[PDB]
Amino acid sequence: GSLTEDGLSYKEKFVVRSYEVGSNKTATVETIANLLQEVGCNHAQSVGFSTATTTTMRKLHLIWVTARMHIEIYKYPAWGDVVEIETWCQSEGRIGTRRDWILKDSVTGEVTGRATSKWVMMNQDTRRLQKVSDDVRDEYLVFCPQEPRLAFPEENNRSLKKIPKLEDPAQYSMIGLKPRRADLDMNQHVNNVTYIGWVLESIPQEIVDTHELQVITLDYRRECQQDDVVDSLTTTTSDSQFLHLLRLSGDGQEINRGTTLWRKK
Amino acid sequence: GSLTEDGLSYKEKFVVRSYEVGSNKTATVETIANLLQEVGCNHAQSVGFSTATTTTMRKLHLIWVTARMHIEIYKYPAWGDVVEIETWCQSEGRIGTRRDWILKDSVTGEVTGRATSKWVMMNQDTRRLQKVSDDVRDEYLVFCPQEPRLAFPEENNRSLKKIPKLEDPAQYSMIGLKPRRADLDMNQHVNNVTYIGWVLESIPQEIVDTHELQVITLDYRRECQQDDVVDSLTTTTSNDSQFLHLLRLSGDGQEINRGTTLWRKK
Ligand SMILES: Nc1noc2ccccc12
Ligand SMILES: Nc1noc2ccccc12
Ligand SMILES: Nc1noc2ccccc12
Ligand SMILES: Nc1noc2ccccc12
């Protein structure tokens, strides 16, 4: 992979692996989400982030945390295909930052997918959110394009729509989901992609067999600890559309809410 | 990746990814096992296997299934490091075939790991095992070296040791493990690497925090179906710690796997 000529975005090519594909022999949405996080990490490393916190963030024990992930796939790359992904960051004032991605077929150059994410600053010890200071902002502004560059430019598009809370009883559910060591990242926290997999666990297999996932929007509210147990709830709201909720199996504390849009194969 | 000059083995280089590493910022044994299966698939594709069954196997509805996996790691590659893996197959008569792997640091060229696996032929529909026929053997012999080439050449080496059955009560356990869609392969069967992860779930976190996994041997006896629930059992059998492992169905206690692990103090 490499930073582009202007040093304001990063591109990397990936060959889809045998274990990364589903029954259609194309990459799963979890493989795509893993590749988006990989190209994001390689981008941070390439612009100087130590092995993505700035000097002032490390001093104040502050970290970036995902608030929302939104992915739209037009065509999933097949096993053996090369997919090229370009990513960049942009500040959205004191609220936080946005990381965007564009996925392309390396052979044709056509856009096969796009993604966007909202990141907020959190104190790693107290878990208190807080806005972005001018000192922190000034440290990372030099790595972002200044004119707006949006993967989702359309005025008030799917990536920015408010998501309601699923009301009991859910139409479908998958209960007692627990993370194993492979679900954790290098910091022993549950990987963000695991939550996407858990959301998808409550979609009936008949939908997965006759449809392709087109759009997924996920809000992150609270993290699942290594010893927590999760229930995944889904209700049809309609192409098929679903409303999703992940909550702790015991007291019902919300961890995530989301929506999915599926296209008939 | 590419077949070597003689066309009897295959090599591929991998850059270790950020999500593929554990708390030590080096690749997990499950990432290594996934890379071994990836280089194995690329080897089958390179020698002509359709997207690894031969013409006669497809006609008879026969497939290769793993009976045993054995992995020994000297050094786990760090995040961003390039690891080179070489793999080859050898027939072991009518019993089945063996696939071996060698892992190397691409920068130094030193051997950082090795692995070996035993594969048996099974009818896809009835699940009945069988010896390999001469017709099937003749179709894949041309892709294997004829002189023995062993990743584990040693005399009474660990890769061929018989594994006993763990007796209740287990010292440690992790109950109610279920596969999710990411645990399935392109044929909707549980991926072999998932079973390694489930075995490791019952190792106490204190061992994982103070030791590095050196050797893992796993026998495969029965597959976990998409709607089955598994219990992972572990008992210490021992600077080094050794454990005996058992995976069984949560309900009736039907064995799916048995294994052993060897851990060295960090
Ligand atoms: N999950 C991630 N997407 O982009 C990133 C950039 C730096 C670190 C983590 C990520
Ligand atoms: N990892 C990063 N690359 O560019 C950035 C700009 C702002 C915040 C983080 C990053
Ligand atoms: N899991 C595997 N290791 O090697 C292989 C070769 C062909 C197909 C599957 C595998
Ligand atoms: N996938 C394969 N590459 O070489 C082989 C030799 C024997 C059996 C299978 C394979």
Q: How far, rounded to the nearest angstrom, does the alpha carbon of residue B60 sit from its chain's CA centroid?
A: 26
Q: Are A3 and A46 in contact (CB under 8 A)?
A: yes
Q: How many residues does chain B have?
A: 266
Neighbours of B3 (CB within 10 A): 15
Rounded CA-CA distance B117/B150 in Å is 11
Nearest chain B residue (CA) to A198: B180
Residues of chain B contacting residue A82, judged by C-beta atoms under 8 Å apart: none
- The torsion region of residue A93 among left (phi > 0), alpha (psi -120 to 50) and beta comes to left
Pocket test for ligand 1, best of A32, A36, A41 (most atoms within 8 A of CB): A41
Q: Are B244 and B211 in contact (CB under 8 A)?
A: no
Fold of A2-156: Thiol Ester Dehydrase; Chain A (3.10.129)
B44 Cβ contact partners less than 8 Å away, ≥ 6 residues apart:
B52
Write down the domain spans for chain B: 2-160, 172-265
SS (H, E, C) chain B: CEECCCCCCEEEEEECCHHHECCCCEECHHHHHHHHHHHHHHHHHHCCCCCCCCHHHHHCCEEEEEEEEEEEECCCCECCCEEEEEEEEEECCCCCEEEEEEEEECCCCCEEEEEEEEEEEEECCCCCEECCCHHHHHHHHHHCCCCCCCCCCCCCCHHHCCCCCCCCCCCEEEEEECCCHHHECCCCCECHHHHHHHHHHCCCHHHHHHEEEEEEEEEECCCCCCCCCEEEEEEECCCEEEEEEEEEECCCCCEEEEEEEEEEEC
Fold of A172-264: Thiol Ester Dehydrase; Chain A (3.10.129)
Question: Cis ω on the peptide bond leading into residue B179 (within 30° of 0)?
Answer: no
Rounded CA-CA distance B159/B176 in Å is 29
- Ligand 1 centroid from CA A74, angstroms: 23
Resolution number, Å: 1.7
Neighbours of B246 (CB within 10 A): 25
Short-list A21, A33, A135, A119, CA closest to A78: A21
B204, two tokens: 């106490």
SS (H, E, C) chain A: CEECCCCCCEEEEEECCHHHECCCCEECHHHHHHHHHHHHHHHHHHCCCCCCCCHHHHHHCEEEEEEEEEEEECCCCECCCEEEEEEEEEECCCCCEEEEEEEEECCCCCEEEEEEEEEEEEECCCCCCCCCCHHHHHHHHHHCCCCCCCCCCCCCCHHHCCCCCCCCCCCEEEEEECCCHHHECCCCCECHHHHHHHHHHCCCHHHHHHEEEEEEEEEECCCCCCCCCEEEEEEECCCEEEEEEEEECCCCCEEEEEEEEEEEC
Rounded CA-CA distance A8/A41 in Å is 15
Q: Are B99 and B89 in contact (CB under 8 A)?
A: yes
Top-tier CATH class for B172-265: alpha beta
- Active-site positions of B read 187, 189, 224
CA atoms within 13 A on the CB side of B147: 0
Please judge whether B79 and A51 are an interchain contact, meaning their C-beta atoms are less than 8 angstroms apart.
yes
CA distances from B209 to A57, B5, B70 (A): 27, 43, 23
Pocket test for ligand 2, best of A4, A10, A49 (most atoms within 8 A of CB): A49
Q: Are A84 and A12 in contact (CB under 8 A)?
A: yes
- Per CATH, A2-156 and A172-264 having the same topology is answered yes
Q: How many residues does chain A have?
A: 265
> At which residue do the structure tokens 């290098």 appear?
A186
- The crossing angle, in degrees rounded to 10, of helices B192-201 and B29-46 is 170
Residues of chain A contacting residue B203, judged by C-beta atoms under 8 Å apart: none
Q: Are A237 and A207 in contact (CB under 8 A)?
A: no
- The torsion region of residue B25 among left (phi > 0), alpha (psi -120 to 50) and beta comes to left
Rounded CA-CA distance B63/A176 in Å is 34
Residues with CB under 6 A from ligand 2: A 43-44, 47, 49, 52, 89, 97, 140, 143-144
Short-list B183, B167, B177, B228, CA closest to B200: B177
CATH of domain B2-160: 3.10.129.10
The C-alpha of B126 sits at a distance from chain A's nearest C-alpha, in angstroms, of: 22
Question: Cis ω on the peptide bond leading into residue A77 (within 30° of 0)?
Answer: no
Pairing of strands B230-236, A240-248: unpaired
CA distances from A65 to A128, A129, A131, A255 (A): 11, 9, 12, 14
Residues of chain A contacting residue B42, judged by C-beta atoms under 8 Å apart: 18
- Ligand 1 centroid from CA A40, angstroms: 4
